[PDB]
Design a protein around this ligand. Structure first.
Ligand code: CA
Ligand code: CA
Ligand code: CA
Lengths: 597, 597, 99, 597, 50
């Protein structure tokens, strides 16, 4: 007899398809995640005490002493138990914030400001989201981020140095990095970083492969404060997709006839056509020069959960992203996949072709088929948004269940406490001794900046402070530093867009923001940019934006980008079981190779 | 020994969770889909001929004769085979468009206009997406829409009468429905519809339950051109969520202190806060009074695949939705889940509470937990968008594989050809004899209106034409009438939003578009509106927008909203297997009852 | 009692040996294959054109212009589809050779 | 819903394909093999003894007495146990060869020759290879060869008669069978065989179907010493594929142009093009007239395992196969599938088309596809060689585990001992009484031939000897007679080639070896030969070659050919599960019917 | 004329060649290929005979 397949009922075929995808996901196997050893390494310095100090772990919200170390180690140990269980009552049983006033019920803060506002505590943000399963993609716990840099490492000295330089450069305009007015500060930044071992010496044979891949070399004006994804170091700083508008309704080609929209100029003035309405690319403007958490007492109340959310002030109006601070503001409130949805919308309105290895992409006289639900605009619009929560579950597992890395504000608090005490002949937080010894010039600049901030805040004669100035009043979100929610969603989302569109398409005209007015001008850049490169640049924009705000380190961002790429690849592989058609997605990965799915 | 369950590895628990959800979906069972019987009922009227005419079936793209009937029945029978097969080569072998010129290779059209433009053909949009499986939700084929109205039915005469009245009323302003200057037309519309059996007589015991559910009664100024979802018929015609902006960045409560955004007024000028940038509610303005496909030759060219997409003219600028035509323009280009994502963003910025039966919703002093990834803003933002393509797969199965119902333009074609022939004492398309007999007054107004259009278009002395005027140059999309892509996505998306938010929350101040100016005014409505009621209204606004453009009937829209609700409910049920927490979604259904999931 | 294994018929032992070897091969797992990225990197140099050139890809057999670049990108895209499908009729529908 | 298949991962599909082939092989079921009863039938003739004699079983290597019967029956019974177990130690524990000298450790032989050479013992050659499984094809034990002829049967009298006639005809030239010089011997052979019941009387109703199929009728010059596969009895004795060379490099057709190789004449001088080098068809030349094991003492040392391998002498040079002895030499050293690989190579070089029911066999302008890996030269070259070890495992099971039939040399030893003793008024080996009684004329010829051989060997006055003269010094290989390794590989290999090529192609020019020179001449044969017939002839050449050497009987060969055919058919059926293409192999079987696989 | 750099793909490091000489000109890198004569004994010698 002649060998055959057999049919079954549609219901059974749907069931078997879903089981086959689960089985594909299972057969990938799993890998363990490894932490850096700090959690139990560092100890309480008190004689007659057998406790870890937990100073290099995320403890925001747990009650801290006057130096920013936690008071009761059981408070952190209980927090870890609650993270791994997820039980609601166990979370409600934890200790949050400082001691309370018997009569009002209010938390007693250290600062005059927090007390005058009568601030309450804010809580941890999905501390057990790493336990949730999902109907599609790699399980949250099946994949890994490598060990975070340690406080004593050359890597961390370079990372925190970079963040202080960003904080002090917040009022610099992107289009003015090369201007004589900025020459003194910019060159100080470049010289300071090139003075650090991480940047001035290469990796050694036998170093961890992950460290080798993320290590950076010579700092230039062309790479200052940039990422390392391919495309990011080429051309102007900001991706086209965060400043330009799009083609508008009424511009169209109908047979041999060209129609021009009456609103065509909106394209070059920051308006994305959004169906039949618009999106404006102009960001709200945070008070220039105003930074937060530069006073130790305010800083400590924040570390004890004082809810400063919403305390910022703003100038009237809006403007295309202009300064380093404006990018921090952009990533303060963005709605999840916002940046990538907006890039997707620009790409559709401008008629950039989809990946040519999908079906039905030919002229319709040839294939008799147009695209929408599958292989078209609706398909890409669902996929770019859907991968986001899957990427987030994975990064929550790393954040809370594995690494619990302290945010940069807390590293600056150790540095400041360490430096102040050393000046009076004492040692506190010897773990950051290298940073204090090496970053002398930068910290003196921070000290001067912070004195000015504390005076404007109402303190005529402030204690010296070497704290890292924050763009936001509340500083970091209420969850650990490693990895990043913003950068994981960025990795996932741009992976989808590179794969779905013909990502090799070249950009025709390159723009940047004008030096003198709030408008777009033609860039003088002479090379060629591609859609894929500008998508990568966009991912690196949103991710470094968090760093410029003072809430992530370089390593958090890069390693999260790679994690999100893995989640998105996995979802595409599982979904491929559901189509009858003959096709694949061509994906140029962050490492410069291509996978066909 | 004491009864127990046991642990297994994380990877196996994930696999088992996915199979369990596939099993829950399989255990729902499946139901068949029944068509109305027209496809093989209507016959070619020539004697010595043995073919179905297919005149009540979607045939856009197949070659038509001078009356709008397909020339070769095998062209349709082959289209049906390719739909059920999905094979790309079988699709490319279909006949699309008219005869081509041997030397240029271009289609030869009937109209001077299509030939001067040298138009090519456009093709069917995912004619086999109904075969596609999905990793979550009900399979596309497991659910059904009921049989569509037939051409000889009171329901159909009512439906097509309404669409003409919408087309002739496209320049009527919403804020002026009840106003003296529109009294004559508005009362003509109301009297005409109340003169039809479907509206002036109730259903009879023994009629299909789906007919009883969707039949409408007495037409009034308060229900004219509205939907029937609970909430749609109270208060102003347009949902608050398609005309109002939102609270802006800088308005906040920080402890005992209230801060005010410098841009607070943007809320009442239709700017939605979109992260740190904005969306504007102002729509593009299509040239008032210009309709399309009012000439028989141009109409036939469109039925033969002539690609007129992009041919509309616009005025400068943008305005809040003012006329019926403006709603048509809104739904011509909207990106998928656009209306519902924008409502979601307004609800988030204004701080409307999440469903209180979710976890972690209490003040953090009580529960020690805030929300984002699960049960917060990122969760709802991903959920509202991801349901869209699963709903689109199900409606594609109903569109192409089951019902293949002709679009309203094609019904209009049959009415026009029948009336013109009857004046010469000839009978063509007797199937629409009843609409032709009962809609005399409406059809005389259409003929005058069509003459004025054909004169504008450059015809010095137009033949008489009773065609349904189209808001769009290309008419309907390239896929069947029943059901609707817009309405199915609306049903699914508003289902997610009502379940995730505390949808019982009452709206504070109710707005409307001003009679004199491009701005909002406070409405005189006294009564209370709820979030759930305004979300339903929003779904009805987008769905009836399609009707006002001339591209769907009433029954397409209502039956599609029911189907999209089913899809969203199923996705929520299967996903509930993925969480450790104790919680549910409370969802007020379209039928007035509540399911807890 | 003393632990033991047991005999079965020769035919079943042969069947089981073959499945066991299939299982050993399945339990090795699989790895993906990564290409160098050229195929969609290099573009047609004409302005107002939106195609990959495919110049670094094997195109022997598809029609070439006077410089050795393929004339019609759809000829290559169809070749790639037929490769992944294997269907004999799809292969016979490709364009092979000049006019 | 519409009935469907579903996809799974490539890995699972490969696994399921391999399991499905195993299941196909299992569902064939199995059959038992039946032996002829001799093993326990014949008894020791000693009074006061209850032992089988095992005289009709293979016992080569076990110590024999002066009449060639085994000394200790436990030695054979242990050998049988070792065969069915395969355990290495159990095999090492067996008794091999005669008694040994306490000082040197050397075996003490009967003959002066074996002692002067200091010969050691040789061992059994894979006595348990019938226990090994395989990843593809029918299991070794699932199939059967029927009972071997018994010593008392008319069949065996005819078989051993034939072998003595071959041995005495070793210096006859194939091209001279019909010559007056050879008339006396050739006619003696034909008359002697036609005098035997097997050949002169047909089978009877009720005889075993296997016997009916292999029974031979009237002996003629045209069928003398030939096989019975279809094609073998037509045209010259030797297959074209064992004498002709092939088309050579540089002979080619390029469009409308014919190129001629400078080496074109090599074709007709026995050179097969072997890639870019050559194979010569000229065989080494064994000393004409020199035969072995014609002295009882030498014969007995061989039966006791005396390793005479490599003792032959040769004339210098090489020549196309010329005499019956040259064919014996050919099959003394051939490398497994050698003959069939060489035929395959001739067929490829000469451009014989593949089976037209495979894919892609049309002109490339029609199918856009050439062949190599699948359905081409590489495919056939792997398949023709791969089936050989699978065929061998099956024949080892029959040889060792089932039948243990004695080789022809041992039958001649019984005949000689029987005849010598009868002349002195005694009875030994009454089992061969019929052979001795009937073969009088042939044995007297053997006696004269053997006297001459023993004189040339250095014995001036030799004892009379009626032994069967051997072509090889060692006689048979160290494994039983039924079936044959050579003939099973032949059956398997030519089955592959008939199926893979268009086996109905007719041969254009027929050649044979020249009567007077070492060269090829055109045959005067007037009919038509096909590729399939000449492939069958080749199988029968190699198989009868073993008989001409003195090491197999007719029945061994034919029944092994049928066994190999079954193994090759089974492998093709299991492999057919692995292809996506639509095709089959057309196979003309040995029985004259065709199977499509 | 230059070695691989730390961080290059491992497959590149494995296959990169160094200084070209008369002894390695046009040869492979499998162990054994770069010692003795260019052609393998097995493509030029015959064998022991019958
Ligand atoms: Ca197309
Ligand atoms: Ca809470
Ligand atoms: Ca071919």
């Amino acid at each position: 007899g002649i060998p055959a397949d057999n049919l079954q009922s549609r219901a059974k075929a749907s069931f078997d398809t879903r089981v086959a995808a689960a089985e594909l996901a299972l057969n990938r196997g799993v890998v363990p995640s490894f932490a850096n050893g700090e959690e139990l390494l560092y100890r309480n310095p008190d004689p007659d005490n057998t406790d870890p100090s937990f100073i290099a772990s995320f403890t925001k919200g747990l009650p801290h002493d006057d130096n920013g170390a936690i008071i009761d180690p059981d408070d952190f140990l209980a927090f870890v138990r609650a993270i791994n269980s997820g039980d609601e009552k166990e979370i409600a049983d934890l200790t949050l914030g400082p001691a309370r006033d018997p009569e009002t019920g209010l938390p007693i803060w250290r600062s005059d400001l927090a007390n005058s506002l009568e601030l309450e505590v804010r809580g941890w943000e999905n501390s057990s989201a790493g336990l949730t399963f999902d109907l599609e993609g790699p399980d949250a716990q099946s994949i890994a981020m490598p060990p975070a840099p340690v406080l004593t490492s050359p890597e961390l000295v370079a990372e925190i140095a970079e963040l202080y330089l960003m904080a002090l450069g917040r009022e610099i305009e992107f289009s003015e990095f090369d201007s004589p007015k900025n020459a003194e500060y910019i060159q100080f930044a470049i010289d300071q970083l090139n003075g650090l071992e991480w940047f001035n010496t290469p990796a050694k044979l036998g170093d961890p492969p992950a460290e080798i891949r993320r290590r950076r070399g010579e700092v230039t004006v062309g790479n200052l404060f940039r990422g390392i994804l391919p495309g990011s170091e080429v051309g102007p700083y900001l991706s086209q997709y965060i400043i330009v508008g799009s083609k508008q309704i009424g511009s169209a080609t109908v047979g041999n006839k060209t129609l021009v929209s009456p609103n065509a100029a909106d394209e070059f003035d920051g308006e994305i056509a959004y169906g039949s309405i618009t999106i404006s690319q102009r960001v709200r403007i945070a008070t220039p020069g105003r930074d937060f958490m530069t006073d130790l007492k305010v800083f400590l109340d924040v570390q004890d959960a004082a809810d400063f959310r919403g305390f910022e002030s703003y100038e009237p109006g809006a403007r295309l992203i202009r300064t380093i601070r404006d990018l921090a503001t952009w990533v303060h409130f963005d709605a999840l996949y916002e940046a990538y949805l907006n890039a997707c919308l620009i790409l559709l309105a401008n008629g950039v072709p989809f990946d040519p290895n999908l079906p039905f992409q030919q002229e319709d006289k040839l294939d008799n088929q147009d695209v929408f639900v599958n292989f078209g605009s609706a398909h890409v619009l669902s996929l770019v948004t859907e991968v986001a929560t899957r990427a987030l579950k994975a990064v929550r597992y790393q954040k809370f269940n594995i690494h619990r890395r302290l945010r940069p504000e807390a590293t600056g608090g150790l540095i400041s406490v360490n430096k102040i005490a050393a000046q009076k002949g004492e040692s506190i937080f010897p773990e950051v001794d290298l940073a204090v010894e090496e970053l002398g010039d930068i910290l003196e600049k921070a000290e001067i900046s912070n004195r000015k901030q504390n005076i404007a805040d109402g303190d005529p004669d402030p204690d010296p402070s070497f704290l890292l100035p924050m763009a936001f009043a509340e500083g970091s979100p209420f969850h650990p530093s490693y990895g990043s929610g913003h950068a994981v969603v960025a990795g996932a989302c741009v992976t989808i867009l590179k794969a779905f569109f013909d990502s090799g398409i070249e950009i025709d005209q390159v723009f940047e923001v004008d030096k003198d007015e709030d408008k777009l001008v033609k860039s003088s850049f002479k090379g060629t940019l591609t859609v894929a490169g500008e998508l990568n640049k966009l991912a690196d924009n949103i991710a470094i934006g968090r760093n410029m705000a003072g809430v992530h380190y370089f390593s958090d961002q890069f390693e999260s980008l790679l994690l999100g790429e893995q989640v998105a690849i996995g979802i595409l592989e599982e979904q491929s079981l559901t189509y009858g058609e003959n096709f694949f997605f061509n994906l140029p990965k962050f490492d410069g190779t291509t996978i066909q799915i």
